[PDB]
Design a protein around this motif. Structure first.
Motif, PDB file in Angstrom:
ATOM      1  N   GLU A   1      -5.737  20.037  -0.918  1.00  0.00           N
ATOM      2  CA  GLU A   1      -4.434  19.840  -0.288  1.00  0.00           C
ATOM      3  C   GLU A   1      -4.272  18.868   0.906  1.00  0.00           C
ATOM      4  N   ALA A   2      -5.489  18.663   1.534  1.00  0.00           N
ATOM      5  CA  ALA A   2      -5.445  17.570   2.737  1.00  0.00           C
ATOM      6  C   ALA A   2      -5.228  16.381   2.159  1.00  0.00           C
ATOM      7  N   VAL A   3      -5.598  15.907   0.886  1.00  0.00           N
ATOM      8  CA  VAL A   3      -5.148  14.471   0.450  1.00  0.00           C
ATOM      9  C   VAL A   3      -3.973  14.442  -0.441  1.00  0.00           C
ATOM     10  N   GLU A   4      -3.201  15.694  -0.516  1.00  0.00           N
ATOM     11  CA  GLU A   4      -1.870  15.507  -1.029  1.00  0.00           C
ATOM     12  C   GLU A   4      -1.006  14.543  -0.389  1.00  0.00           C
ATOM     13  N   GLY A   5      -0.219  13.581  -0.990  1.00  0.00           N
ATOM     14  CA  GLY A   5       0.521  12.417  -0.459  1.00  0.00           C
ATOM     15  C   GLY A   5      -0.298  11.220   0.054  1.00  0.00           C
ATOM     16  N   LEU A   6      -1.649  11.521   0.076  1.00  0.00           N
ATOM     17  CA  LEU A   6      -2.536  10.326   0.454  1.00  0.00           C
ATOM     18  C   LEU A   6      -2.233   8.937  -0.526  1.00  0.00           C
ATOM     19  N   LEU A   7      -1.894   7.968   0.124  1.00  0.00           N
ATOM     20  CA  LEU A   7      -1.522   6.649  -0.458  1.00  0.00           C
ATOM     21  C   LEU A   7      -3.032   5.489  -0.526  1.00  0.00           C
ATOM     22  N   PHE A   8      -3.287   5.076  -1.657  1.00  0.00           N
ATOM     23  CA  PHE A   8      -4.240   3.982  -1.370  1.00  0.00           C
ATOM     24  C   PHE A   8      -4.067   2.872  -2.380  1.00  0.00           C
ATOM     25  N   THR A   9      -4.784   1.554  -1.889  1.00  0.00           N
ATOM     26  CA  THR A   9      -4.602   0.625  -2.880  1.00  0.00           C
ATOM     27  C   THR A   9      -5.918   0.701  -3.728  1.00  0.00           C
ATOM     28  N   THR A  10      -5.685   0.193  -4.852  1.00  0.00           N
ATOM     29  CA  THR A  10      -6.755   0.197  -5.995  1.00  0.00           C
ATOM     30  C   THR A  10      -6.365  -1.063  -6.751  1.00  0.00           C
ATOM     31  N   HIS A  11      -6.922  -1.166  -7.938  1.00  0.00           N
ATOM     32  CA  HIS A  11      -6.986  -2.314  -9.017  1.00  0.00           C
ATOM     33  C   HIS A  11      -6.156  -1.867 -10.360  1.00  0.00           C
ATOM     34  N   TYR A  12      -5.584  -0.654 -10.406  1.00  0.00           N
ATOM     35  CA  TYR A  12      -5.380  -0.149 -11.629  1.00  0.00           C
ATOM     36  C   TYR A  12      -4.480   1.085 -11.666  1.00  0.00           C
ATOM     37  N   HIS A  13      -3.732   1.264 -12.716  1.00  0.00           N
ATOM     38  CA  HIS A  13      -3.172   2.798 -12.981  1.00  0.00           C
ATOM     39  C   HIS A  13      -3.009   2.739 -14.479  1.00  0.00           C
ATOM     40  N   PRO A  14      -3.655   3.755 -15.334  1.00  0.00           N
ATOM     41  CA  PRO A  14      -3.460   3.673 -16.796  1.00  0.00           C
ATOM     42  C   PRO A  14      -2.311   3.620 -17.280  1.00  0.00           C
ATOM     43  N   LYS A  15      -1.231   4.253 -16.542  1.00  0.00           N
ATOM     44  CA  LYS A  15       0.061   4.281 -17.138  1.00  0.00           C
ATOM     45  C   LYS A  15       0.724   2.833 -17.063  1.00  0.00           C
ATOM     46  N   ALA A  16       0.014   1.966 -16.117  1.00  0.00           N
ATOM     47  CA  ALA A  16       0.522   0.603 -15.944  1.00  0.00           C
ATOM     48  C   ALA A  16      -0.117  -0.391 -17.069  1.00  0.00           C
TER      49      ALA A  16
END
Ligand SMILES: N[C@@H](Cc1ccccc1)C(=O)O
Ligand SMILES: N[C@@H](Cc1ccccc1)C(=O)O
Lengths: 350, 350
Positions: free
Chosen positions: A235-250
């Motif tokens: 639960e503590a990482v719910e709503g956590l935002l992060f930068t990365t390289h990819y999302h499969p739906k993209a």
């Protein structure tokens, strides 16, 4: 007879990263097991998530195994331990995922298939300030990781250039207790905390921050991007935002859409950035060998840096004259125990 | 009312370095305790030889103490932890002794009074190959220290460009047992081992290497340059050759000759590089403030980078537009339990 060293953290503190890259490399190699009519042999060498052993593995790959090329590592600290070894011995190296600029800077033989941290840092700085309206951020830096030290610097330069204010706190890889840092953090009355380390510490900071009553944003870099973040964090990482390289739906180009379906069929879940990036490191290296037309390491190195309009699993790959890939930043968010796409930041949007 | 943070390792594994710089800073400050008619207060902050605490000290110096400028650190890893903090907050910083290029690279506010490691590395590479006739060298790198990783790279680039051959082994700060590395080292049948770490490990490697029967050269960088090297190493460091910044018997300009006599009078022994370098960091900073004509941090930063023909304890100081000093490498040798001058290598001799 052609040997490629695959140098990854298969065990130790960041072992999830080695697993995820290896899964993608294995898919690529099954798809394209030969190059220039010769069988490609992978030589998997475990770094154990250690600087010393990454360095040792690269030394052995070159001195003993006589490899043609190296794919690895993931952590910038570990890629920085081995990049000089590759360069000194003129052995082409492609990192799937190290983002620190210094990996490739001033070298001819070392390149990457991902973005670099001036952009990754700047992208979250703009996102936080413009999109989230964050004005006061506590930046948590892992002093043991060149990746963290660099990303924090790049984020802070841009965030403060925008008019934001920052407080810096410091920890080490392996730490379990972040009470001192969180106490300093909270006294700054932040809108957000931004953590530039890896998933094990990001998860523990997040639990401890929420347990304290922190209701602001928790932000991180690509170091967050392992399912273990959620496994540890809950639960503590719910709503956590992060930068990365990819999302499969993209996934957009046909190699990327195919990689999603192939990965899903084998594993029963969507692929993640490091899966796609592993596949691309391999395919880019072999594409470069094919363009070289021979196993001359200098020509292979030259061709890696001429890669243009290459359809990769992680996006269209274009590698600049410094060995850095021109790639977009993806902002993702944890929602209901999995990872949603939130936004794409292309270089021009800054 | 003018405060200068002095950020040094006064305790922990490399505490000799903090002692030696502080002794020189104290001499300079007694000589010139005021600038622009105002009293200069030194704020001594102990890094405890730790990355986290160096970073914490710099954060506190800027956030809490509101210092005008920072003198420090010594270890490149520690200066690299704090240089971004100084830059982000536009606080001028002068390191007496960090040699890694990345300390100043891409920054306006961070400068040094010493050479950088491309030169320090290249100088020993040429000395070893040309002067000692070494052709096979085992390079021992401390993976935890940015200084070591960099110097090893720079030495190896030049040594191999000359036609030499190298084997690389790896250790960590704090290690006591070098049996595995020495076993690899000896199997290479080296003419010399070159160790790019700090005195505690250099001394222990040297004892263990000699105990093994190694009769070749033991070479190191400026990390060797503490009397503790001899205190720990004894007979095993006799004939050890190292690059550094200084030898008191080479003192030439009048500020350098005076510093020798003043240091001798206070301490009953010849000064060493880090004593002279501490004095120079301070005097250069105050010289820059005087040329600026005010306490405007941007003008002070600009003036540090215009320092030319400055008579320092460590030699004539000229700081380039990148914040790097154009300085000569001194090769010293341990003989009969003290340090002799062996040679000077000016930039042009390479
Ligand atoms: N970019 C990180 C590694 C990483 C990439 C992608 C996902 C997770 C980790 C580094 O350079 O250390
Ligand atoms: N040059 C070393 C520090 C050092 C200088 C001089 C003497 C001893 C140590 C570094 O950058 O880490």
């Amino acid at each position: 007879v052609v040997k490629i060293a695959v140098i990854l953290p298969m065990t130790g503190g960041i072992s999830a990263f080695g697993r995820m890259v290896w899964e993608g490399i294995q898919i690529a190699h099954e798809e394209k097991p030969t190059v220039l009519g010769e069988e490609v042999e992978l030589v998997l060498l475990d770094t154990r998530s250690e600087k010393t052993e990454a360095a040792n593995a690269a030394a052995r790959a070159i001195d003993k195994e006589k490899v043609l090329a190296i794919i690895g590592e993931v952590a910038s600290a570990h890629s920085l331990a081995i990049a000089p070894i590759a360069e000194e011995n003129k052995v082409p190296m492609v990192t799937p995922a190290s983002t620190n600029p210094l990996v490739t800077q001033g070298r001819k033989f070392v390149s990457r298939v991902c973005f670099i941290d001036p952009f990754q840092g700047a992208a979250m700085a703009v996102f936080a300030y413009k999109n989230l309206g964050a004005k006061r951020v506590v930046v948590f830096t892992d002093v043991e990781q060149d990746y963290s030290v660099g990303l924090s610097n790049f984020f802070i330069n841009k965030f403060t250039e925008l008019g934001g204010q920052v407080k810096r706190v410091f920890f080490r890889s392996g730490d379990q207790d972040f009470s001192a840092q969180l106490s300093v953090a909270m006294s700054f009355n932040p809108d957000a905390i931004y953590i530039t380390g890896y998933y094990p510490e990001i998860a523990l900071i997040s639990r401890q921050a929420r347990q304290l009553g922190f209701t602001g944003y928790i932000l991180a870099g690509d170091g967050a991007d392992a399912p273990e973040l959620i496994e540890i964090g809950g639960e503590a990482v719910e709503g956590l935002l992060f930068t990365t390289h990819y999302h499969p739906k993209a996934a957009s180009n046909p190699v990327a859409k195919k990689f999603v379906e192939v990965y899903k069929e084998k594993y029963g879940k969507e692929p993640a950035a490091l899966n796609a990036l592993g596949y691309d490191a391999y395919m880019v290296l072999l594409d470069a060998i094919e363009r070289a037309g021979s196993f001359d390491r200098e020509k292979i190195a030259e061709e890696i840096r001429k890669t243009r309009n290459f359809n990769g699993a992680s996006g269209i790959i274009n590698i600049d004259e410094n060995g850095d890939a021109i790639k977009s930043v993806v902002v993702n968010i944890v929602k209901n125990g999995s990872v949603d796409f939130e936004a794409v930041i292309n270089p021009d949007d800054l």
